[PDB]
């Protein structure tokens, strides 16, 4: 596990009310949500390195990011 | 808001094997994360608006998750 769990229980409930206004979210439901999030971003922070390195750099930048997505087909 | 922060982020990156970072990253990261969620939740929403669940369950999440 890796980010303190108060938001996005805050940031989540924010967009959660942005879609179907009074949808509430069950205990343990949102639990799951963070677990995917981390694996996904770690899943991307490994990839975005690859950009950097094909570019033969090291401090990764937006460059690498946006790039990784348009290639995954995630644009944007 | 996107009030989530940078040390969480460096911890993340290195686990991804990131060796170094730029500062720009940190906002970019929040911004894209956003897109991730509000994607998947608008998707996970439905499985529960479809199953007519009041408060949204975990099982419908994995479904929203079987999808890219």
């Amino acid at each position: 596990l890796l980010i303190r769990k108060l938001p996005f229980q805050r940031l989540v409930r924010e967009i959660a009310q942005d879609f179907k206004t009074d949808l509430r979210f069950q205990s343990s439901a949102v639990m799951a949500l963070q677990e995917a999030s981390e694996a996904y971003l770690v899943g991307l922070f490994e990839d975005t390195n690859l950009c950097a390195i094909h570019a033969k750099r090291v401090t990764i930048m937006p460059k690498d990011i946006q790039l990784a997505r348009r290639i995954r087909g995630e644009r944007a | 808001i996107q009030g989530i922060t940078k040390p969480a982020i460096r911890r993340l990156a290195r686990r991804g094997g990131v060796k170094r970072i730029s500062g720009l990253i940190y906002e970019e990261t929040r911004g894209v994360l956003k897109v991730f969620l509000e994607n998947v939740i608008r998707d996970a929403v439905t499985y529960t608006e479809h199953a007519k669940r009041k408060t949204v369950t975990a099982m419908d999440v994995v479904y929203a998750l079987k999808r890219q």
Binding site: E35, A36, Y40, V42, G43 | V62, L65
Partner: peptide, 23 residues
């Protein structure tokens, strides 16, 4: 008659980790 060898609890995030595959 042993074993269907298996133990874990909330290994419904074991499954999570594996559709992203990590470690």
């Amino acid at each position: 008659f042993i074993e269907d060898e298996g133990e874990p609890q909330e290994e419904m995030s074991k499954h999570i980790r594996e559709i992203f595959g990590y470690d």
